[model samples]
Target: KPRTVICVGDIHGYISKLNNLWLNLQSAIDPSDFSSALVIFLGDYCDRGPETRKVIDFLISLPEKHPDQTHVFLAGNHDFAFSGFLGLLPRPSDGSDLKDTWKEYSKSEETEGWYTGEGFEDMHLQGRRWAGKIKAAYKGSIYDAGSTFESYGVPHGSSDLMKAVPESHKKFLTNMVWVHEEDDVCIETEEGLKHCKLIAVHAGLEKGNNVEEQLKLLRAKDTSISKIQHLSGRKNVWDIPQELDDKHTVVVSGHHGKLHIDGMRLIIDEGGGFPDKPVAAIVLPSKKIIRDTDNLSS
Candidate 1:
């Protein structure tokens, strides 16, 4: 039997949307196939929408709910910041202070309102950015993090989220991988069912960079760089790298805030954490797109 693979887009803390999407997936996919499908969540789980806590709770319960499925959670830029605030990210391998990573964005600190709360002294750049009060809102709030903090019963810029966030949630956030690669995956191309290597990252990979080297850095979870481009980059990561094209690699990501599918490259973040938008996911081989608003009954 052919295995089923589902790549879900940025959930952004909307529990209802995720729940509905899950139900829709069940309705769309065959029962046995859905139960055993390899589900890959492309991240940005915390930060936008209202029910961050409940969203996480739902995700945490998945293993027990369906023991046979393989679940891979890749961290989004928002999630990286959230983890940074919790001090869950790995330290720089070169033994540099976390504060050193702040230098590149130090100039923007005053304007961006980098967090100056209790543990801000040692927090990562993204963590500080996540908790900081921005001068302007990106999508209702800076990084749209106010909701995430509120979801934990803490104010947006409070250090209290450290205590407010449960250990289990921290574990879930910390366990998220930076990248996932599956060999010989099948994707439907015009020619036929083509077996290609699938590379899943939160945001897409940067163009012009060596794929192997990038994969090495991501797999190591290296925090030496102040900003991880793969998780947060915009135009740079929009397309599949030339090297990957030759190798027939399928790059799947969610962070561009758009639902774009161009041959081997797939960017699936349709909701983009908007209040009115619906979350989306894509099934492989068939390359079927399913949304929470797909008319599936409750």
Candidate 2:
């Protein structure tokens, strides 16, 4: 029997939705298969909702609860920014000041309300954006981060979050991989079953760049680029690179704010961290979509 592979989309601090989704997945898949499944969470675990602390606690418990299951956590843009505020990200390989990255996005600083508090001098672009105050609020707060800070019992935009965040939570944020690749994964197609290599990133890959080069940059967790395209891009990173077209590879992502599966490319973020929306996940080989809102008798 083939191993079960499940890719979960952005949790975004919604512990209830995540809990429901988890329960649903247990009911949806066979007990034996679910017990040893390879589970991959597509990041964005800390924003928009009211229980970021609980969400991370739940994730941290998985390894001990189900030792047989393998889990992969890919850092999404929001998570990256959250980590930035907590000072969890690794420095640039070149030993340059984190402030150097601000040069490219400086023009939008005033408009975006980039944070300039206690640690602003050495913060990453996304960190400042995540903790900054936006002129207009979107869904309760800028970046929907007020809930995250509140979840940790800190005020938004306050440097206190760095000290408030738990060490294990910080470890979880820092250890997130930018990309994950799995080989010999099986997926069903019109031609029947097909084994392919799957690349899982928070966002999709750029079409023109060499796939290996992109993988190298991601694997190294390079922080030189102020804005890492694969982690936070929109249209440019919507598809798989040209190099992988003939390589029997599946490109999967969850940052597009939409759930779209075309051919071998999969974008699984259905909720986009919206409170009213449903969090979703995709199962491999069968390509079945499981959502928190699904009404299953099991």
Candidate 3:
């Protein structure tokens, strides 16, 4: 029997909730009978939440645990930005100040005070602070890979957060793909290119873009015309339920926070940046949404 495909939404560092959600999903599917089920996780595995380290550990461990089945992980924009800051540094020619970098690291439409047009100034500031806090929290077990932060355009430092991560985990982060560009449409398997009746992305699909055409454009590395609409005020991703010509390829994305489209298009970022919300995971085969709300104080 073909096991149901389980697709999880963005997990922003909430490890405990992520564990619970994974266990609950296992119970829902009864792994004894459907051991071959596939698990796909959308990116944004770090930042915002408190347990970013744990989240990354779990994701890296999945492939080893389920060697028989496929575990797909797609990178979101946050992942890109984080990696970029970690590995790339400001060039002498760039002539940018420290304040500028700080703004770019933290600036987003969703976050107040940090305007989107500030470029990378604030990002450097926020990234340094964030990295420092992580180090202080972890007591300096991690080491700074000048390459990782440098590649992501973040400044070089020897903070405790940089020292807390295990070398193995750093390698995992270094190797992980920051973004996946397939045909505009999302599919479960690489062969036959079977279109997923339900598509899950970090945000949502760009409206007015033909699925096939999008796929072709992506295949050619051309995204000049990809139309993406943001839900709420977040600009990283979008989720929309456009009427498709066929019954296949319905898209679902998180990035904009938690939203339930009542089976049309589901947005599962409700627990954004809070330990209370923890983690939210959805089943692609059944569209079953399971979230860990144990820590939610409200």
Candidate 4:
């Protein structure tokens, strides 16, 4: 039997949107299909909206609620920052820390307005950057985590922020994966059911780079760079790697703040973390899209 893989987009702390989206997923997909489906969340569970804690609580409880299904949680750029802030990101296998990452990007420290607050010295480069102020020239306006920070009863960007974060939530942060691959996902076409290789990253893979090497760096949870192309790149990771075109491969991601679907590339993030927008999920094989607003009273 073909499995239903549900890929959820970025949920930037809007618990109402997330709850509705979950209900809509149940209402949209078949009961049995939804029950045994393989679920992959594309991260960004914190920041922007309110209720980051509740959003996480709902996610971490999924396995217990539905024990038979497979669940994969990916780390988004915001999540990476959250992880870095709490010192939850893993150290490199070579025993390297974020200091090694600092040397590589020191030139842009002023331009990027790198953070040098009380605890900045010991924090990872990404953590420092995440805590820094956004430049006026930059777009996407760094995820405003004010509401999220307040949700946990703390000031945004305060020294006491880490202390306010719950231990279980920190565990959730450290356990998130950077990349996930499915060997034999099936996608339906007019001709037949084609077995396609699917790769789901928080944003998308870095193009023009060796896919294997990129995956290696991501899997290793490299925090040396202030920004990961896979977690934040738009045009750079907009398409499938050229090498994978020879095979039936599909690349899906969310973090771009737009919903785009090309032949084998699917971006499921409709929420955009805006009130007007709604959270969404895509059901594989059938390619059916479901949104939180799909049913008003379901």
**Candidate lDDT values, in order:** 0.89, 0.88, 0.49, 0.81
Query: Rank order by lDDT, top first?
Result: 1, 2, 4, 3
What does the lDDT read for residue 292 in candidate 4? 83
Please give the distance, in angstroms, between residue 47's alpha carbon in candidate 4 and its true position after superposition.
Answer: 1.1
lDDT of 4 by residue, 1-298 (tens): 7999999999989899889888888877777887899999998998877798999999989999988789999998888887876778766556666667777678867766666667676677777666666666222125566666677887666657788888988989988999988998988777788899888898888767888999898878776665788998888888887777654887889998888888788898888777689888888888888888888342
Off by over 4 Å in 1: 136-141
Task: Give TM per candidate.
Answer: 0.96, 0.97, 0.61, 0.91
Candidate 3, residues 24-49, lDDT tens digits: the string is 76666665533666666666676655
lDDT of 3: 0.49
Q: RMSD to native for every prediction?
A: 1.6, 1.3, 9.2, 2.6
Backbone collisions counted per model = 0, 0, 56, 0
The ten-residue window of minimal lDDT in model 3 covers: 223-232
Question: Over 4 Å off in model 2, which ranges?
Answer: 139-142
Instruction: Give the worst 10-residue stretch by lDDT in candidate 4.
Output: 134-143
lDDT of 1 by residue, 1-298 (tens): 6678899999988999999999899888888987888999999999879899999999999999999999999999999889998999888888998888899988888767888889887888888888888785453246879999899998888888899999999999989999999986788888888888899999888888798999999999988789999999999888888678764898999998899999999999999998799899999878999999998642
Model 4 C-alpha RMSD to native: 2.6
